[PDB]
Design a protein around this ligand. Sequence first.
Ligand code: HEM
Ligand code: HEM
Ligand code: HEM
Ligand SMILES: [Cl-]
Ligand SMILES: [Cl-]
Ligand SMILES: [Cl-]
Lengths: 151, 150, 701, 701, 50
Amino acid sequence: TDDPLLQGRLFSYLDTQLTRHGGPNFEQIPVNRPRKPVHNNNRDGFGQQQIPTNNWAYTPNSMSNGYPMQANQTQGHGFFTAPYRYASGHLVRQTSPTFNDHWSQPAMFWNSLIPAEQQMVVNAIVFENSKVNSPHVRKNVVNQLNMVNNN
Amino acid sequence: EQDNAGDTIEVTEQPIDNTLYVNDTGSYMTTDFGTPISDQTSLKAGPRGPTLLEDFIFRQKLQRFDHERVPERVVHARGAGAYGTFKSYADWSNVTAADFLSANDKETPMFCRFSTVVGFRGSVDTARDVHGHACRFYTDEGNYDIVGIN
Amino acid sequence: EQDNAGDTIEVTEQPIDNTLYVNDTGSYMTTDFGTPISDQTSLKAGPRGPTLLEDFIFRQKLQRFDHERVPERVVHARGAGAYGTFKSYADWSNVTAADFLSANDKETPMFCRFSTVVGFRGSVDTARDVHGHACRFYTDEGNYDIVGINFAPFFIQDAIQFPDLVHAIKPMPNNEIPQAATAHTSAWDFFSQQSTALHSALWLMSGNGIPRSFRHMNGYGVHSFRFVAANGTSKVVRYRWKSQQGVASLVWDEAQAAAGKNSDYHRQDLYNAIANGHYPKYELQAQIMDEADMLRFGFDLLDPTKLVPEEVVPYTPLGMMELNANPTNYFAEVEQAGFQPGHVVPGIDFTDDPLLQGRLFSYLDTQLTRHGGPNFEQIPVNRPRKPVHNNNRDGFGQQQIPTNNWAYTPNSMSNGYPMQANQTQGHGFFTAPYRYASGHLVRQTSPTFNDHWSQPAMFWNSLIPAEQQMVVNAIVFENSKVNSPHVRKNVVNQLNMVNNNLAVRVARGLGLDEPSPNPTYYTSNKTSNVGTFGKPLLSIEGLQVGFLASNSHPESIKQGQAMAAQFSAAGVDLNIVTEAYADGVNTTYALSDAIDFDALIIADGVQSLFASPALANQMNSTATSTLYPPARPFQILVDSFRYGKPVAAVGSGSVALKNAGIDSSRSGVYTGSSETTEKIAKEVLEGLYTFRFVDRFALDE
Amino acid sequence: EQDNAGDTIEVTEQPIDNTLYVNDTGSYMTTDFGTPISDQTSLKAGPRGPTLLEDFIFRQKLQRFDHERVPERVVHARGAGAYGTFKSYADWSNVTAADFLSANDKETPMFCRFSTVVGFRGSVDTARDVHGHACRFYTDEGNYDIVGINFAPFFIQDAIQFPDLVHAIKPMPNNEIPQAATAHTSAWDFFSQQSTALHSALWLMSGNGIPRSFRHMNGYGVHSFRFVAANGTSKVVRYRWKSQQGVASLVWDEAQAAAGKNSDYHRQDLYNAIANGHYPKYELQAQIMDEADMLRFGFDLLDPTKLVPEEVVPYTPLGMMELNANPTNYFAEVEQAGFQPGHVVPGIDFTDDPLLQGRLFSYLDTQLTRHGGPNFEQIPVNRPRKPVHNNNRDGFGQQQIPTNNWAYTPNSMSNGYPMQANQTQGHGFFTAPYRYASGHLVRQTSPTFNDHWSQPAMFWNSLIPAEQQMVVNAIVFENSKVNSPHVRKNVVNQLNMVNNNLAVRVARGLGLDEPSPNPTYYTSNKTSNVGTFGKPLLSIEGLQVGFLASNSHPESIKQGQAMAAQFSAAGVDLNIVTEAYADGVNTTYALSDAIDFDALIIADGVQSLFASPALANQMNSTATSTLYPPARPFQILVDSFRYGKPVAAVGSGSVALKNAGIDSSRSGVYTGSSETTEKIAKEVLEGLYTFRFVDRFALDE
Amino acid sequence: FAPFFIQDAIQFPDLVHAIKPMPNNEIPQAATAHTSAWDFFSQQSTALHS
Ligand code: HEM
Ligand code: HEM
Ligand code: HEM
Ligand SMILES: [Cl-]
Ligand SMILES: [Cl-]
Ligand SMILES: [Cl-]
């Protein structure tokens, strides 16, 4: 979905795999391998421990007997974006006004805890905000919490 | 390792795919994580629209591409290789305990690479240069490399 | 950050050494950690003993050496760079808020790199190829890079196909053959199965594929971009760098000779020109179009396989660039430089060109590969001229020391620094606000992109007959090297959708059946400034003259030397060539070839050097010169003439011309007695501007 | 380089930005390539639309973030650093040509990092462990690093065994359990099968394994090194950093509590001390021995499992270090710092210690892992204070720009620069010239290394009875966590070769058969300054006092505050603790534990806070305080007393003491009326120096 | 937890730097109990639910 938090995670996690693995072949590590063999025209990179036999590593070509075959909604069980998805709008760096209520759900959550666990939340907030060294931040936290539940 | 329950360790080996040589015959294209794909058009907000960040098919393909290259050799960057075999003329144990030399007609698999020295990866074969002659014997007692020149 | 003692932070800045350029004068050698050393003998257990592990001097030196190399660029690996400056012709604020364009005579520092595409790091300069023209403006509002090429169109219409095009044109994966060339099955297979490629393929087969030098080609942005004004109004623009030297190119067999004689031909040309004060210039120009123009001209401005003809929208001159300094260290400054089309500044924006859109991802990601980590922008050549301030942190190779301990937004601790910048404060980047999208989320190509053949037809019609023959010869050469008959035939059929005459001539060259006219996409239209023969140069500065003399006729050297003042005054290098160095000699027969000179002059009284190979072959073994291969002087002459270069002969030099079957009546052949050398020089200057004499090139239909 | 035009090279240095410390004040946010930005909302196709690939602002920010991390150190991952200065006591040129030691009062900049060994980057400070003490002198002749630990001996005698020791002590490979601890089968298996480990294992089980802070331990070089004089004569030396604060340690259950209450206990201690002006000091000392001393003392000076007893060779004071500034950015300066024992300077040399010899390889190689490339010495904290000059080139992350284009020796082009440096010119490094080797090339251990047990015996005899009990408790704790009976028994048998009493007490703790005396390696010998209890501190600066008060008795706060001037004057922090912040309150019961204070004072009139858990348990649910867990004040008191810390009580505070079963007659218990608080303070100062009252620790045999 | 702290991925490095140890001294470990985290949670009030 167009969840702006989800949308960025899609970039971030693919990129971050480079950092931890030293190179682009992180999916070749056993725990990350799919259970069926991979076939695509990706090649090379540090730590390449496979040996491609298809010497015509591009699409379209007339040399490889059509392999590997393009997969889509109607053949090969290919991935497909949900076809009724739609977008319409200026290209904007603006937050949706539907996102503006930051406090009602915190209030519901508070009401959802037994009295003993409500005390636990208070004790935690008090513990953490006593460790916070800045009085003005302590006061900002209080004011925010007061928009959630006065008690 | 097992005079006690704590140091006793259960090993469950998982049925992980262990392909070496890749054979495309018959196959649909998949990502590196095995999802079947096409790879010929970007996902866009309308046919004349901008490309979407969520097009993971685009990103995985170009990330592979963007990372294909590795440092060339500091010397002997330009070279070419081939596999072969080596046959001992004799049992040479009187002078060497080397196993690949331990019997008449004993055969050992080989891989060699030949190269120039000074030029970078795509430099001309017929440069005036030293030439490398580097061969690996895949022996029963380890890979023995003779890394020589002409 | 200081309403309390705990969050109050004491900053003590340490007096750390901050060298940029390294200057060895006066110094003793030290390790990288500053201990003075020698580095010439290993530490050993006795003078004939084994080397010791404790020899840290040995290990630090070889560890540096063992780690010198980094990955080359996946494309455009082979290239060369230079610094320069850009001057705006005007205040362009009426169309763009870009700061480097905001005032008449406003100057901005520049760094550019030029390259081929397909060959690896040490491949030959004169490969037939696309050429990169990538320039960074170090503006006051960030590094702006125009990452262009010497052809107006590109091969494909979507970035997702880029690895397909590249694997197809690169050497085959089983054996890594052939180097730096499209002359193989896979490339022509791709160009014929992916018929978007035809426009750029024709460019590649023309002289545009084999330029004389980086100084004698133009640059193109290829894609539509946007100029965005302060108030949000945008224009759609296409960039051209118009070379102020002019456009000039080689012929194929000459490009081959150059590859074997001087693989560094273009990088040497650029280095020498700058070092000699002949600074190359290129005028920045833009076709400045309205949003309403997207589909008006019968193709789509989002389509990178299509140029806008100058005759439909003229190029508006924006300003002038000049390159005026060589780099100090090639690895540090050129090899490590990373250009990105996503390096934009306020007042510039993108379009929905699906080729451009993917480049924006690719170039940022690829910088990791070549630099080993995320701090590639911290490398000096990639730094902006003003200090960076943001909340990015850490990563391999971090050589800065952040002092802002509250590295997040929003915060109440950092006094609002660094401040958010946008359209209305701090000169922040902004997307053009009238841009809009509307549609299903689709992996479909636009039908406006479907005509792959009409523009190839226009391009063909835009070449003089001699260069049309060059295209045929190239296609025939490359497709003869293609090993697959079916691919050869596919190429013919594709070419027949472009122009029947073209396709018939190619099929004839390939020994294939001649196709019949297929008029759907044919046109008589043509455009200007897209060819490389038939139009003279605008400047001959930094071109080369070879003056062929002999030590066995000493007056010939003096004759050469007395012409030198005139060439020098035109910024042309006169090279006196003999058998061996001597007083006044610049270079030798053994070192020389036709490719080394843009014009050739034969001295008076040296005709006996110019024996043909046949004559050479009679007298072999004894009393044949050892100082150069048999008939080297003759070959220089015959080659120069064949390639179309101006040739002059003084006095009995005309005997050499006759020996070579060159009539003194041919265009671009100058003769005179020893008393008229001054006039012969000026005719050579004339011929250098014309550059090539196309009447020498064989024509067909 | 200039006998000709071709080899003459024009250098044009470009005006590139050269920021080190980054200062955000006044600035707008920019990308890394200098374009002004906001960074708070993704670019989307409509406000509820998908994020666009062209949002380069999003991608550059997350790419930086996604790449922030680097590999931690394979050992000593968890650590903290600070800058300081070193002052020589003398001109030491009679024994060493080292430049930082060449004059009385000569000052050299310093950077040190202290660490544990086994735990990963975010493991608990108060793990039982070896501690690193690694210091760089930024000398005029290169960066000299002493990379030491807080124990005098090391576990193994050959560097090739280092991965064995480390894999054995690190978490098990199947499940990565347990963290930061030797309390598992593999470690004790290793220590018992590789009996060289016994000396260091005893150190580890003593208070030395759990120091109070980095400021309250010593440092040791462990290995023999050499001082080399200008004329080539050498001395064999061993280094000790003698803490000028003194040596003090925790007890195990306290180290555990600290791990759960404040994992940053030692790094916070060091940061706060420096920030508060209480700069830690350590005196550099060396046992300065003759070459003839190698085997004289009944063990081998090449052997790193052996200390030289101060009573055999005294430590010669060389100079004083002080650490006086915190780093500005932890990642840039501390995380990236790379110490190497091979970072030596002229006047220092190595010995044939097989443990030292391998470290010289290992640390240079390991820097590649953590920095992603070979230019790790170019990181600011690793740079020498004078500019580097050598012919090393290139590599990932090259942020310098060499100007010497003739980067090889010998050459005739560079004017002899940089010049070779050696013993007799340029202050070059030189191996000590009388060093000699003679022998077959052997993979054999020296028989001089065979006594693994005598020095462990000396160490045991060197501990007060209370700390001997601590060693037994630790061994018993760790070997109860060891899951393998046969390893437990091997450990006992090994310990029985050291001291029968030790081994019997351990076997009793483990429920095993008691071994019988095995006198071969037993000794009554002992050495001084190797224990951590029974000897007072030399300075109490930067220690902490907790003053337990209550908001429900307001005069208690005022009582606390009136004592503050006296503690402040001693450089001791007085922390007033109540239920919740209020005028004059420093911290709260809920935030507090015994581990937070080095001494505890109970205020007059607050006795009712100090209800025991039993009393707490009666009245549960309503009217029990929510402001801290039940019996928190009582627990602070009982814990402080158990751990051996000084405790004082004013007035009715003595009621709290009685509730806790603490008689006012015990050592390190101070009581007084409200009129004698000044005297109570000075007794607390007294108790802080004694530091722990060992009469409280249970003893066996 | 069912909800997350922020509504846009571009803010992720902000949330993370805020909750991670301070950059000058890398204190404190594995904890939000410090000025920066609670500053972030209170200036970026989307964080209250989580
Ligand atoms: C007898 C003299 C030498 C010979 C016969 C020789 C031979 C070779 C050969 C044949 C290669 C290419 C191997 C391949 O095809 O991949 C090579 C690479 C190399 N040589 Fe040498 N070499 C010599 C001297 C040295 C010396 C003295 C050094 C440095 C101390 C050295 C360092 C290297 C390095 C770093 C490589 C790159 C290897 C790689 O990246 O895999 N060579 N040498
Ligand atoms: C209009 C079409 C294009 C033009 C004009 C163009 C231009 C260039 C140039 C001039 C360079 C060399 C820059 C240098 O000198 O360092 C380059 C490198 C590169 N190009 Fe392109 N390019 C185009 C299409 C693409 C596409 C579609 C992609 C991929 C989506 C791409 C990916 C790359 C990559 C990965 C590099 C290596 C950059 C580096 O390592 O720094 N290019 N391109
Ligand atoms: C006398 C024995 C030893 C002492 C006193 C010692 C000391 C230290 C210290 C203090 C550190 C942390 C430096 C820092 O704060 O960054 C360290 C790290 C290290 N030590 Fe040792 N060590 C000893 C033995 C060894 C041995 C035998 C080896 C291997 C042959 C070794 C390999 C390492 C490595 C690889 C690191 C990581 C360094 C880095 O990543 O920068 N150590 N050692
Ligand atoms: Cl959605
Ligand atoms: Cl658009
Ligand atoms: Cl020695």
